[PDB]
Symmetry: C6
Subunit: 200 residues, 6 copies
């Protein structure tokens, strides 16, 4: 079965985030995990999917960058996909999913990521939003456009970030589970950022 | 006579949308069905045609995307065209239809769609509107620009979408007629979004 | 010699449009008819020439499109030029005419038109306006920028459009004469839209 | 030495304009006349040189257009240069003059012109202004951005244009002297348009 | 036991900036130094890292600019990385650090620098801010966008800059240790600029 | 010694500008003059270096333009550099100087210049401002954006320009010393324009 059976993390408001990490090879089917993210976004998440992307920088000069991980978060769930190089056709499901108009893909500082995706992979996100910009405009606070994930969450929600900070402050030491925890937390924070702004 | 004799769907307001689905070959003549769409738009639909487009992702990096379906909706009708690869001359009628200045082509999150259509197929929509941005500006609510089809309808119309949600929440398991039902509902919803915006 | 001796149409306000349709061969001198359009625009029409362009869609993916005809409308005149493929030298006068700063070329939804003209035919309109945007601004009505010919004329002039609609609603069943009629009427309508806007 | 020894024209305000026309061939020395335009602009014209450019259209699709005339007008003068195809080294002086920051080059509908000039001839105008857009912003009248030479003068200066209209209405029938006259009058008008915007 | 054990400098407010200069070779590990920068920014700097870059100009005409060194500043620390000609794999740490969304990279007059980094090295800073622009907008003082490092510090902070000026005035005769001092001072100045703008 | 021992000009207000003109060959060291310009800017001229550039025009079509003089002005100095074609390596010092963030390079109508420098020479000015746009926005006077050097100074400062006017009106007849004189006066005028705008 497909379930989010990696570690659960408890957020500062007492809620839990269920997690799943997949190493995608040439024949891994991620489609059932993408379906759960989508189903959860529609039933429970007001049709947002919060995301982040990670690159393997390879030695035109940015051509060498290749997408090595994708995080997809909803209120309840965090799916972390580790991707191979190169892609095989099983990754067509990720492309079809990122092109969907069922949900909005919400990210932080994604302007360059979107060009890299399109130019290096032909991956297109039809319904994306770079959320600092919306935050800045909704709040009339110009600097929110220029904040990283933690700091945007801080200036929008003012919640406790002590756990997230202590992991990030020592990132090079942090184990794979603590890195996953930091990713899951940031996903939840941005989920909350978005719920806050889309209702204001 | 050419008619929309496919499944009929009843909208939350009690109206009935008539559908037609066409599998376009090398020979299908789609002319009579585009004429019906055009006629209903002019006579009953205030010269709006609502649309959506569906791509087959093939692997310059976006140049492998190929348009695999097109939806065209008016209040009364929903024409769904499944298209081949490559196109044959009989699809010239569709290029001519989409170039028309008789009606306005209303879409949701179509900015990338327009560029792919243009770059990959030479298909030009001379009179299009990416409807979310007009919504945000008319209603003075920034977030509307960044919403997918369902959620835009929700935030502009505040009508009941339980049926729509239930189908899309289980997309990968929905049969073709349910998926058509969802396409027809979304068509009708954005028709109503447009009618509400053009007039206010 | 030269004159607008084609069909003459009566507009809803009782005025008339004279028309002329020429099949441009390799030999045709179109200068005299261009001269009459320019004369009528300067002496009677406040130096507006209203225009529309009609494409043969052919199979850079848009580089297949070919200018099949041009409509030029003034106060009293509608000239319809049907063009060959490829163009001959005698079409140089149309290039000079369209480049003129004596008059403003007023069109509806011409942004893509102008790109296709320049890219495919090296045809440059130095003094063009895509008139819906001016309408929208001049009048604080956002949707006008995104309307087609008929609906823009409707929303700006509020005049009788029953006859135009009946021809357009069944475009496919319209003879060359009724299609010319619709073109003449739309030309006349957009002359009026322009006269009206240029005073606000 | 060299002087503006062609016809002189009376303007509707009772001033005069002196005129010079030259057909430039490979040995022509135009520098004495540019120095006169420059001197008159600096001492008499508040450092504006009004201009227009004229193209031999030609079979990338616009790369065959070639600059065929240039007009330079000041307070008192109007210099009309007819150019060869191709240019010779003696035209270097025109390139340098057009690059000067001693004066502002004030033009009407020159956006495509500037692109053609750069791309086809490498001619750069470092200090140029497409004056209808400044007219529109300065006056808060949107339409001024979208007007031709005569019409923009009409709508800023509201002066008598019967003479200019009579020539341009019959343009195809006007002799070279009458064409020169219209160029000189339009030069004078945009001079006065400029005076009106700059100290507003 | 990595530590910032190069020269330390006393700022005008009595605080001390500790520095470290690394000559990066084919095998140097810089991750412990970057980690100290990141740790200090998160725990003490509110997630800002101030930066500047230094180019070797070489003789696509800008393709010969080569990145020679980079400075990364927090209030407490200033790291200088002196870069080799062939970057090896050990420099990927730097690419990943500059790509981070944990912190915001704050620079002065960095628009060209970002294009050059991207074009010549494939180095992308996903979360960057050209701080002069924010200061101009924040303070409503237009000229701030167009100031160099010292002058922006002056116009925002009004602190004593005699020591900095004295080194910069004689820049070519200042030895490497004073040039290093000037760089550390400017890093501290801009940290201070940012701390004002980010929550005032 | 490196000193500004060319003609010294007295300005309208009793201040003086010292000049130096250098015919840069393949071997000339210009760095002691650059250091003098930078020192003066830092110590006495509020970190502005006013500049202008002069092109040898060329027969892509603008790729033949070649930089032939550069003028650099400060509070007290005007350096005028005449460059060879092609450059040799001794000009790397000028590329370094122009990339400095110690000062602001203030220019009048330099938008095309910056593009030609980059495209043709790979010369990058990291901290440049096209000052007319700042003047227009600062002063709420639209037309300043479109003025050449003298007229901008006039409209910002309102000082006496008879001497400058007298030389430029007869530019083709002025000796090399009178042309320097004009270049020096223009430098001093924009220095003052900048000091004035810097305070608003």
């Amino acid at each position: 079965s497909a379930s989010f059976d990696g570690p659960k993390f408890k957020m500062t408001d007492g809620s839990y985030v269920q997690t799943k990490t997949i190493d995608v090879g040439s024949s891994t089917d991620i489609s059932p995990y993408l379906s759960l993210i989508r189903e959860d976004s529609i039933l429970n998440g007001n049709r947002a999917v919060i995301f982040d992307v990670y690159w393997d920088v390879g030695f035109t000069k940015t051509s060498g960058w290749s997408l090595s991980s994708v995080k997809l978060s909803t209120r309840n769930l965090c799916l972390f996909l580790r991707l191979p190089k190169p892609f095989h056709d099983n990754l067509k499901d990720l492309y079809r999913f990122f092109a969907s108009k069922f949900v909005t893909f919400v990210g932080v500082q994604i302007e360059e990521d979107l060009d890299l995706l399109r130019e290096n992979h032909g991956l297109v996100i039809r319904n994306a939003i770079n959320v600092g910009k919306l935050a800045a405009e909704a709040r009339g606070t110009l600097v929110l456009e220029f904040l990283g994930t933690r700091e945007l969450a801080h200036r929008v929600l003012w919640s406790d970030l002590g756990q997230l900070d202590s992991i990030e402050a020592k990132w090079e030491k942090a184990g794979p589970e603590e890195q996953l925890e930091a990713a899951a937390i940031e996903g939840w924070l941005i989920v909350n950022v978005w719920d806050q702004l889309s209702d204001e």
